[PDB]
Amino acid sequence: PRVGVTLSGRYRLQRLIATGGMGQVWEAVDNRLGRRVAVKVLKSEFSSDPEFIERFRAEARTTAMLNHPGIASVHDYGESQRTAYLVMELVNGEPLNSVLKRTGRLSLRHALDMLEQTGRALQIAHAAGLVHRDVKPGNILITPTGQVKITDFGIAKAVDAAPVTQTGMVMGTAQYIAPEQALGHDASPASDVYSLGVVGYEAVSGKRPFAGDGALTVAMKHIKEPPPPLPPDLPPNVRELIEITLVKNPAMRYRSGGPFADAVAAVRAGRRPPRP
Amino acid sequence: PRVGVTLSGRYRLQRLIATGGMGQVWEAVDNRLGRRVAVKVLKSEFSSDPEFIERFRAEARTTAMLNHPGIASVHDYGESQRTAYLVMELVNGEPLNSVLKRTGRLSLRHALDMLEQTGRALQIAHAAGLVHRDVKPGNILITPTGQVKITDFGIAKAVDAAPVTQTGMVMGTAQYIAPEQALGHDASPASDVYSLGVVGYEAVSGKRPFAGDGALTVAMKHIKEPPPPLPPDLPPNVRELIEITLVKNPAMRYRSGGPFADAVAAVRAGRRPPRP
């Protein structure tokens, strides 16, 4: 699993570009079309699990039928000679977590824009029956021109993990988890909204709203802790928009990506956040 | 014409906030609704001209029927005891020329956003038969949240000035003039597009494309001079988008605000500028 390997005789691996709990992402060339792409190569522990692969493919498949500037394309699945993989768009952009490592916060203007873009991208997905379920800065790529591209819809949460409250463990991070997810309820479009509110909270104010040593620590605060008031210098309408997104009851939030994005637009336009 | 004057017994002047060739703009309170507003009080030389007032009102009137986040509202016209005025939205934002006095250029991301916002705002106007005719940074207000608001549709150009090529004089600036306007042709939606391309050229690169000592100097360069190549470090698609906007023949540009904005979206999204 390395440079020069040509998966299913089609996709030639060039460089290792991302990594994670489920596998690694590589820059490749599609040699049938002579197009550079991203390939997520799954770890054997996932490749070898029939049922996990079924759920994984169900999500990816749906994402591959969505055409929108803010959804990173999903091109194909394959297995090669044992080794499962997903072929994706190679996005020329920088993960939001990377961006913030430098700036601490985003400019208010850029934050709202990003939030609104992400919300429109999620809404296409939500309209198709598709929940992201792992919204977080590492899944929000920003290109040089400011286009937000959203990666990895559905797939991380296809591992059918028990509640974090009971296991004390999460694949990836619990820093953006929706409280109902941390409880073991299946995500809904309102869960993505909440997790985008966390991203939003981070992006405007400088820091995430909840921290702690370990998944269980942070996840519990999501369930039980009112978030710390955002900085008083932020327009109240902006603060209020974010506060709404972070209510514990999913039934009391903006219900999906479109209503949220619209609420971001009303706020950019100087109006108070609309009724969720 | 000063603080405490209550125009037509309704609008009470508070503070002098803008100024210019045609008159002055004041912060006021509407005392019928208890709402803060902006009032353009016209100079006597314009108040006293029947025909100029007719054309002035024809433009303002049309703008007042457009409801869009990017068009600064036009609320009413009146005359008080002699003195003509136009009642407008009081926009809490900073003119683009003001912004640039500090930053020199905008960030690429902010520039595209502004351009696209302005283009959508112009398109509503263009769809109504309304041309702005004096697109320039001083008519592009930017609020703390990044909402662009466009002021003064139509009205500056209601003075029915002869060609700048022949008079050597322009009311306001010639720095953003469309070549066909500088020639004495009536503006079209494509003229606004061109002038937004100049704004765009300025906003991305640091400086306006044409300068010179006096209206005639700059206006002639608009007619005759190919603009200086934009900085090579800018994405080619961005450069190309702007180059298209600045062709001399209006018939070869994006024809109105919507096609332009769409072209800005394609470029933000990493695609080359669409066919005008």
Side-chain angles (χ1 to χ4, degrees), chain A residues 1 3-34 37-50 52-53 55-80 84-132 134-168 170 172-239 241-271 273-276, chain B residues 1 3-34 37-50 52-53 55-80 84-132 134-168 170 172-239 241-271 273-276:
Chain A
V3 174
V5 161
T6 302
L7 297 168
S8 304
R10 173 154 182 189
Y11 304 102
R12 180 174 179 281
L13 305 188
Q14 301 184 303
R15 193 169 213 207
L16 196 228
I17 72 175
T19 217
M22 203 159 61
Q24 54 190 187
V25 181
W26 282 80
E27 189 180 348
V29 184
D30 186 351
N31 77 19
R32 303 298 109 157
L33 309 172
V37 301
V39 193
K40 187 166 301 224
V41 174
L42 299 173
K43 294 209 214 145
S44 204
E45 291 77 3
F46 300 89
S47 287
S48 303
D49 178 352
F52 165 88
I53 292 296
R55 301 189 299 284
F56 176 91
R57 293 182 71 171
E59 304 300 329
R61 201 155 62 222
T62 293
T63 313
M65 297 177 290
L66 306 176
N67 293 39
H68 193 270
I71 302 185
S73 290
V74 178
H75 288 127
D76 229 85
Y77 176 92
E79 286 166 18
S80 195
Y85 63 86
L86 188 68
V87 182
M88 309 169 291
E89 174 164 9
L90 176 72
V91 172
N92 200 291
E94 168 181 13
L96 178 56
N97 56 311
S98 306
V99 175
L100 290 162
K101 256 45 135 49
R102 315 188 278 103
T103 70
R105 57 161 76 186
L106 298 186
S107 91
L108 171 64
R109 177 245 144 245
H110 186 190
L112 291 182
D113 191 333
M114 176 262 287
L115 289 161
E116 189 175 349
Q117 283 191 62
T118 310
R120 300 286 176 216
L122 295 169
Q123 180 53 39
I124 294 299
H126 301 154
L130 174 64
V131 192
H132 196 288
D134 193 21
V135 167
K136 62 187 186 197
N139 276 320
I140 301 175
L141 276 46
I142 311 173
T143 71
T145 53
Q147 194 66 224
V148 177
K149 297 216 177 265
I150 310 306
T151 57
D152 300 355
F153 278 82
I155 60 190
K157 292 322 198 306
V159 186
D160 259 332
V164 58
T165 50
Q166 304 168 359
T167 59
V170 186
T173 335
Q175 285 165 332
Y176 306 88
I177 203 155
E180 67 275 30
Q181 263 177 318
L183 267 305
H185 303 270
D186 297 320
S188 72
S191 309
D192 294 340
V193 175
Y194 179 100
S195 295
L196 184 62
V198 182
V199 169
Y201 193 107
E202 192 175 359
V204 299
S205 73
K207 259 268 285 143
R208 289 173 222 107
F210 305 121
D213 309 35
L216 186 58
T217 310
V218 196
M220 210 50 46
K221 299 177 184 187
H222 279 287
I223 302 161
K224 302 186 164 164
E225 226 82 72
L230 291 150
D233 74 295
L234 291 167
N237 287 339
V238 173
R239 272 141 40 186
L241 163 68
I242 296 294
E243 286 154 4
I244 282 152
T245 315
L246 305 170
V247 299
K248 304 311 183 170
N249 190 357
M252 283 305 275
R253 294 167 217 152
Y254 298 108
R255 67 111 229 290
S256 76
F260 173 64
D262 288 335
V264 182
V267 172
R268 291 170 71 168
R271 290 282 197 99
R275 189 106 88 258
Chain B
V3 174
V5 161
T6 302
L7 297 168
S8 304
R10 173 154 182 189
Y11 304 102
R12 180 174 179 281
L13 305 188
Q14 301 184 303
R15 193 169 213 207
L16 196 228
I17 72 175
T19 217
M22 203 159 61
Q24 54 190 187
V25 181
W26 282 80
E27 189 180 348
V29 184
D30 186 351
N31 77 19
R32 303 298 109 157
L33 309 172
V37 301
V39 193
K40 187 166 301 224
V41 174
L42 299 173
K43 294 209 214 145
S44 204
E45 291 77 3
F46 300 89
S47 287
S48 303
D49 178 352
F52 165 88
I53 292 296
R55 301 189 299 284
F56 176 91
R57 293 182 71 171
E59 304 300 329
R61 201 155 62 222
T62 293
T63 313
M65 297 177 290
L66 306 176
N67 293 39
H68 193 270
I71 302 185
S73 290
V74 178
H75 288 127
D76 229 85
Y77 176 92
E79 286 166 18
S80 195
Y85 63 86
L86 188 68
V87 182
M88 309 169 291
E89 174 164 9
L90 176 72
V91 172
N92 200 291
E94 168 181 13
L96 178 56
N97 56 311
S98 306
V99 175
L100 290 162
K101 256 45 135 49
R102 315 188 278 103
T103 70
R105 57 161 76 186
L106 298 186
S107 91
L108 171 64
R109 177 245 144 245
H110 186 190
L112 291 182
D113 191 333
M114 176 262 287
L115 289 161
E116 189 175 349
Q117 283 191 62
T118 310
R120 300 286 176 216
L122 295 169
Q123 180 53 39
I124 294 299
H126 301 154
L130 174 64
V131 192
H132 196 288
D134 193 21
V135 167
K136 62 187 186 197
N139 276 320
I140 301 175
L141 276 46
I142 311 173
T143 71
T145 53
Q147 194 66 224
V148 177
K149 297 216 177 265
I150 310 306
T151 57
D152 300 355
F153 278 82
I155 60 190
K157 292 322 198 306
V159 186
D160 259 332
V164 58
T165 50
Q166 304 168 359
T167 59
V170 186
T173 335
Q175 285 165 332
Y176 306 88
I177 203 155
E180 67 275 30
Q181 263 177 318
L183 267 305
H185 303 270
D186 297 320
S188 72
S191 309
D192 294 340
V193 175
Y194 179 100
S195 295
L196 184 62
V198 182
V199 169
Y201 193 107
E202 192 175 359
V204 299
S205 73
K207 259 268 285 143
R208 289 173 222 107
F210 305 121
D213 309 35
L216 186 58
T217 310
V218 196
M220 210 50 46
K221 299 177 184 187
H222 279 287
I223 302 161
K224 302 186 164 164
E225 226 82 72
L230 291 150
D233 74 295
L234 291 167
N237 287 339
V238 173
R239 272 141 40 186
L241 163 68
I242 296 294
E243 286 154 4
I244 282 152
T245 315
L246 305 170
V247 299
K248 304 311 183 170
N249 190 357
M252 283 305 275
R253 294 167 217 152
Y254 298 108
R255 67 111 229 290
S256 76
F260 173 64
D262 288 335
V264 182
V267 172
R268 291 170 71 168
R271 290 282 197 99
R275 189 106 88 258

